[PDB]
Short mmCIF file of C-alpha atoms in Angstrom, two decimals:
data_model
loop_
_atom_site.label_atom_id
_atom_site.label_comp_id
_atom_site.label_asym_id
_atom_site.label_seq_id
_atom_site.Cartn_x
_atom_site.Cartn_y
_atom_site.Cartn_z
CA UNK A 1 -1.87 -28.94 -17.35
CA UNK A 2 0.30 -25.82 -16.79
CA UNK A 3 0.05 -25.07 -13.01
CA UNK A 4 -1.65 -21.51 -11.71
CA UNK A 5 1.19 -18.94 -11.65
CA UNK A 6 1.35 -18.51 -8.08
CA UNK A 7 2.44 -22.45 -7.85
CA UNK A 8 5.62 -21.53 -9.95
CA UNK A 9 6.57 -17.95 -9.36
CA UNK A 10 6.09 -17.79 -5.34
CA UNK A 11 9.42 -20.41 -5.19
CA UNK A 12 12.67 -19.47 -4.22
CA UNK A 13 15.21 -20.67 -7.16
CA UNK A 14 17.30 -22.28 -4.71
CA UNK A 15 14.19 -24.33 -3.18
CA UNK A 16 13.34 -25.55 -6.82
CA UNK A 17 12.76 -29.90 -7.06
CA UNK A 18 13.60 -30.48 -10.50
CA UNK A 19 10.56 -32.19 -12.73
CA UNK A 20 10.93 -34.36 -15.77
CA UNK A 21 13.51 -35.19 -18.19
CA UNK A 22 16.60 -33.46 -19.15
CA UNK A 23 15.61 -31.61 -22.29
CA UNK A 24 12.41 -30.94 -21.94
CA UNK A 25 10.66 -28.09 -23.59
CA UNK A 26 8.79 -25.38 -22.07
CA UNK A 27 5.75 -26.67 -23.50
CA UNK A 28 6.28 -30.44 -22.65
CA UNK A 29 7.31 -29.20 -19.25
CA UNK A 30 4.01 -26.67 -18.74
CA UNK A 31 2.12 -29.60 -20.38
CA UNK A 32 3.31 -31.92 -17.61
CA UNK A 33 2.12 -30.15 -14.87
CA UNK A 34 5.10 -28.43 -13.72
CA UNK A 35 6.77 -24.87 -14.14
CA UNK A 36 9.17 -23.79 -16.72
CA UNK A 37 11.68 -21.02 -16.10
CA UNK A 38 14.30 -20.16 -18.30
CA UNK A 39 15.90 -16.85 -16.71
CA UNK A 40 17.31 -18.08 -13.62
CA UNK A 41 20.82 -20.01 -13.97
CA UNK A 42 22.17 -22.76 -11.98
CA UNK A 43 18.59 -23.90 -10.75
CA UNK A 44 16.00 -26.08 -12.54
CA UNK A 45 14.57 -25.25 -15.30
CA UNK A 46 11.46 -27.21 -15.65
CA UNK A 47 10.19 -27.80 -11.49
CA UNK A 48 7.63 -28.88 -9.63
CA UNK A 49 4.74 -26.42 -8.58
CA UNK A 50 3.76 -25.74 -5.25
CA UNK A 51 0.94 -28.09 -3.60
CA UNK A 52 -2.31 -26.00 -5.14
CA UNK A 53 -4.69 -24.66 -1.90
CA UNK A 54 -7.76 -23.88 -1.51
CA UNK A 55 -7.28 -20.42 -3.33
CA UNK A 56 -4.53 -19.20 -5.08
CA UNK A 57 -3.91 -16.59 -2.49
CA UNK A 58 -3.17 -19.67 -0.26
CA UNK A 59 -0.02 -20.35 -2.29
CA UNK A 60 3.11 -19.61 -1.32
CA UNK A 61 6.21 -21.48 0.43
CA UNK A 62 6.22 -22.97 3.69
CA UNK A 63 8.26 -19.99 5.16
CA UNK A 64 6.58 -17.26 3.92
CA UNK A 65 3.25 -17.98 5.81
CA UNK A 66 2.01 -15.60 8.51
CA UNK A 67 0.14 -16.98 11.54
CA UNK A 68 -3.53 -15.67 11.36
CA UNK A 69 -4.27 -18.39 14.41
CA UNK A 70 -3.22 -19.96 17.46
CA UNK A 71 -2.30 -23.32 18.93
CA UNK A 72 -5.23 -25.80 18.13
CA UNK A 73 -7.35 -23.52 15.93
CA UNK A 74 -9.97 -25.33 14.01
CA UNK A 75 -10.08 -25.38 9.92
CA UNK A 76 -13.43 -23.62 10.15
CA UNK A 77 -12.80 -21.21 12.52
CA UNK A 78 -9.22 -20.27 10.84
CA UNK A 79 -11.80 -19.83 7.63
CA UNK A 80 -14.12 -17.71 9.44
CA UNK A 81 -11.02 -15.36 10.47
CA UNK A 82 -10.72 -15.18 6.16
CA UNK A 83 -7.58 -17.38 6.80
CA UNK A 84 -5.70 -20.20 4.53
CA UNK A 85 -5.51 -23.56 6.81
CA UNK A 86 -3.18 -26.47 5.82
CA UNK A 87 -2.13 -28.85 8.95
CA UNK A 88 0.63 -30.86 6.76
CA UNK A 89 3.91 -29.57 7.41
CA UNK A 90 5.62 -29.53 10.98
CA UNK A 91 6.60 -26.19 12.40
CA UNK A 92 4.77 -23.76 10.53
CA UNK A 93 1.20 -22.38 11.36
CA UNK A 94 -1.69 -24.04 10.07
CA UNK A 95 -3.94 -21.03 9.77
CA UNK A 96 -2.14 -18.25 7.54
CA UNK A 97 -2.52 -14.94 6.21
CA UNK A 98 -3.28 -15.77 2.26
CA UNK A 99 -1.65 -12.78 -0.36
CA UNK A 100 -3.50 -11.09 -3.14
CA UNK A 101 -2.12 -12.83 -6.62
CA UNK A 102 -0.54 -9.43 -8.28
CA UNK A 103 3.05 -10.44 -7.70
CA UNK A 104 2.63 -14.34 -9.73
CA UNK A 105 3.83 -14.62 -13.18
CA UNK A 106 5.39 -17.16 -15.24
#
């Protein structure tokens, strides 16, 4: 299934992880759960989407996270402060500010 827009557009083209086989079409790429973009040269055209989050406002590259909490903040407290919580990647804030989706596109 085609991934939500932010899982595709919020990635730096140079950080793209290739998805599918050589020559996979735009439709096949989307159908496979990947993102397709034929506009940037020299980078994968069919690529893996960013991990899905609780909401699409919480989708962004790990390096774009703005710390909305503190060391040891709980998921619930983070949710109270109106933020996104994700503790699966090292060195990055686990509680972070979400970003409205107007920038997202295919």
